[PDB]
Amino acid sequence: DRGVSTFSPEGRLFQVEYSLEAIKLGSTAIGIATKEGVVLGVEKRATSPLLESDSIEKIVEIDRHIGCAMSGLTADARSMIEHARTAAVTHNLYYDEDINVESLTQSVCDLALRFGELMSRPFGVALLIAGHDADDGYQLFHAEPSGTFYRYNAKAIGSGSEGAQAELLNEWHSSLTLKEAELLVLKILKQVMEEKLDENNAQLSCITKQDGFKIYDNEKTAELIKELKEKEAAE
């Protein structure tokens, strides 16, 4: 057939480029960074109404100061999360401190290109890694299966990504509050989702310096959805 670590004539790795197509088929995930915190939101996308939606775990804690959202082949993310959690805890053991968000992201991205003929193929999942540290403050990173990671003020990944990113382009400014960011994630998720957005098929989360990483209750998100509807009807 052909090598797994083969370059295309354009200078790209076939398998990496193909894994990016799998990520485009995945459910939407959005992240927004502010001076008051970072917000992470995802589309759950249940395949059937009998599926208990609360078991869909697409937002995940890595440490108290770092959270993570995923999009694509979500099964592939489990080993990446396990590594991230181990890396975060191990660093605390060796250095008696929290680990920098960037350093955590770099550790996860080192796994990405460890494939050949090590694992047999790249990961088919992208990650939005959000957190806080004392040096660089509130941060949001986008970790790809290419091994590359970009920092972002705001970022959307998944099926409705390019439409959501264009919307984040206009809406984001440096003086956004946490409440404003929460509503903004809900607004954009509702825009790109197939089914109608509610507390059961969408999930919010945030990371603040004081309280750390928190996944939002369905009751708490429901209120923010109701607050959104009213403010859009206000003009």
Binding site: V4, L50, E52, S55, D76, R78, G116, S120
Partner: protein
């Protein structure tokens, strides 16, 4: 060692070997899982192409992983034994180190993790098996029902079916199962499970297997006559 990458991405972002493993599940005999208010029932299809079978010794479709958790499946039978064995070993290993039996979610997460591992490991093909894992957590009366598939994704279900003609029985369950009020008793839950299989099975003789799991390690398999009584009652009500 044989290191060949069998599971790989295609230009359209698909892993065909994982997707072809799902086709093996589609071929397998139908399996169904329904959870009531205080119980879970696992229904399984037995194809009647094979008669002159010895039903005493033939491998049963529903397998006990521990005294409080069970596992049924659809797909390749030989593949399922490997997952069941690994699951059983991990169950005893968990009891040994944590001094507490596995939760249903934990056991599912393990089996799902094994399935995933076989989708990005060299020299191996994915499992051609989807499982339904059901039971009750230790010292807990809330019913648990989880599903896994070759890709390695898993999730919890109020009710779910897998295997051949699972599209039809899922259609049945989606209209007949109410979340606000699930099957309150064992009878109601078994009846709904047998009904759902009768949409697909053919004859209600030795083609339907039922296994009821209740809290506190109370697992029992229904006999032919017991199931036949459900089959009789369902059709007599249907003649109206």
């Amino acid at each position: 060692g044989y290191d060949r990458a069998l599971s790989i991405f295609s230009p359209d972002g698909h892993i065909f070997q994982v997707e072809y493993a799902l086709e093996a599940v589609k071929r397998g005999t139908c399996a169904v899982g329904v959870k009531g208010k205080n119980c879970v029932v696992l229904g399984c299809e037995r194809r009647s192409t094979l008669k002159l079978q010895d039903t005493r010794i033939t491998p049963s479709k529903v397998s006990k992983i521990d005294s409080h958790v069970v596992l049924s499946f659809s797909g390749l039978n030989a593949d399922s034994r490997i997952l069941i064995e690994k699951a059983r070993v991990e169950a005893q290993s968990h009891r040994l180190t944590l001094e507490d039996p596995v939760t249903v979610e934990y056991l599912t997460r393990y089996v799902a993790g094994v399935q995933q591992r076989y989708t990005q490991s060299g020299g191996v093909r994915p499992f051609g098996v989807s499982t339904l894992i059901a039971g009750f957590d230790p010292r807990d009366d809330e019913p648990k029902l989880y599903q896994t598939e070759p890709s390695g994704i898993y999730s919890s279900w109020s009710a779910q079916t897998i295997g051949r003609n699972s599209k039809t029985v899922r259609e049945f369950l989606e209209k007949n199962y109410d979340r606000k009020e699930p099957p309150a008793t064992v009878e109601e839950c078994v009846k709904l499970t047998v009904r759902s299989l009768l949409e697909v099975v053919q004859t209600g003789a030795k083609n339907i297997e039922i296994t009821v799991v209740k809290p506190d390690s109370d697992i029992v398999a229904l006999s032919s006559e017991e199931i036949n009584q459900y089959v009789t009652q369902i059709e007599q009500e249907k003649q109206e």
